[PDB]
């Protein structure tokens, strides 16, 4: 949902006399910016560890860039999403060049196929599939096939929308 | 003899006044310049004078032909339509009539 970045967000409870060195909690958050990333961090921490924003503090926010954005990768995403029935598990696969791009493709996919909005989706795991045999979905298995090559039938040519009238009937063969 | 034309202007069409859904504002007109289809192309014609040339009934000072002058002020939308301000607002009956966009004041 948006031009997303992945952030390492590290936060903690504020130190007290009883706990002078509180534990540090780290999360990987997909968010459009740092404000949204910190808000999502405190939302998840309130849901999990009962640490509130008023009693806590942000120690670090860093951008986690993709190591090889020019390498084609297969990604598995384990997510849970909320519908009127309740919370449902889902494992899906995406063929992308980065974890962030896979997550955006996942958000668009969930919105298109199940009407799941951003606030009803919990991303639990994003993994890069190390081997071709780790690919489970047929729509990625057909793409990782050996000697893959296809034509593009019925290509509508790009004609300028400001050129209303054409003197020749266009072709759909290139 | 010469078989060429004598046109030194660009053709345009008067489309509409500046308007919303209902309220129209005759003090600004919308002009479609021929062959201009984006804001980058429309930026060339900013400040150019534009004449609406029409015909009256009586001959006044040697002519039956009257002119309303104006200038192109800013682009409009994304499709190369421009906004124009004339000395008097253009007649409402001239929606779809032709106007002449001169090449002066030239910055080339």
């Amino acid at each position: 949902m948006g031009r997303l970045q992945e952030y390492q967000v590290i936060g903690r409870h504020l130190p007290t006399e009883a706990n002078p060195n509180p534990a540090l909690y780290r999360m990987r958050i997909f968010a459009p910016n740092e404000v949204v990333a910190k808000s999502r961090f405190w939302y998840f921490l309130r849901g999990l560890k009962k640490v509130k924003k008023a009693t806590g503090e942000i120690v670090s926010v860093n951008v986690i860039s993709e190591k090889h954005p020019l390498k084609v990768k297969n990604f598995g995403i384990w997510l849970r999403y909320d519908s009127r029935s309740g919370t449902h598990n889902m494992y899906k696969e995406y063929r992308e060049t980065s974890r962030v791009a896979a997550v955006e493709a996942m958000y668009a996919d969930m919105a298109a196929r199940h009407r799941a909005r951003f606030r009803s989706i919990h991303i639990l795991k994003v993994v890069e599939l190390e081997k071709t045999e780790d690919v489970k979905r047929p729509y990625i298995k057909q793409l990782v096939a050996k000697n893959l090559s296809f034509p593009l039938p019925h290509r509508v040519p790009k004609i300028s929308t400001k050129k209303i009238f054409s003197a020749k009937r266009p072709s759909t063969f290139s | 003899p010469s078989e060429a034309g004598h046109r030194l202007y660009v053709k345009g069409r008067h489309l509409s006044y500046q308007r919303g859904r209902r309220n129209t504002h005759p003090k600004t007109s919308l002009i479609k310049i021929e062959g201009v289809d984006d804001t980058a192309a429309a930026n060339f014609y900013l400040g150019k004078r534009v004449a609406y040339v029409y015909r009256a009934q009586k001959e006044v000072r040697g002519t039956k032909i009257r002119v309303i002058w104006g200038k192109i002020t800013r682009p409009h939308g994304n499709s190369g339509v421009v906004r124009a301000k004339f000395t008097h607002p253009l007649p409402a009956r001239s929606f779809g009539a032709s106007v002449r966009i001169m090449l002066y004041p030239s910055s080339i």
């Binding site: 598995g76 384990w78 849970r80 919370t87 449902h88 598990n89 889902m90 494992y91 795991k125 993994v127 599939l129 780790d134 489970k136 | -």
Partner: protein, 79 residues
């Protein structure tokens, strides 16, 4: 049926203001009534909801189970 050759009177999708206002009022009243019924609901509810778990088609589920086992072993050793 003979719908194509002899269609019947059309069903209008043009809403009336009276029906729109009535439906909005009824939806709001139903929301308030459902909130009151949820407040007075005597049906049993669990303190902790049932978890779906890890999907079987996730290819590293066994490694995740291994990581959970080592984490709980380390927690039991520390505690």
């Amino acid at each position: 049926a003979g719908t194509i050759n002899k269609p019947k009177k059309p069903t209008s999708k043009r809403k009336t203001t009276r029906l729109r206002a009535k439906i909005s009022k009824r939806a709001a009243e139903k929301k308030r009534k459902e909130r009151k019924l949820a407040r007075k609901n005597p049906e049993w509810r669990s303190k902790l909801k049932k978890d779906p778990g890890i999907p079987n088609l996730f290819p590293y589920k066994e490694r995740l189970l291994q990581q959970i086992e080592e984490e709980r072993i380390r927690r039991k050793e520390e505690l």
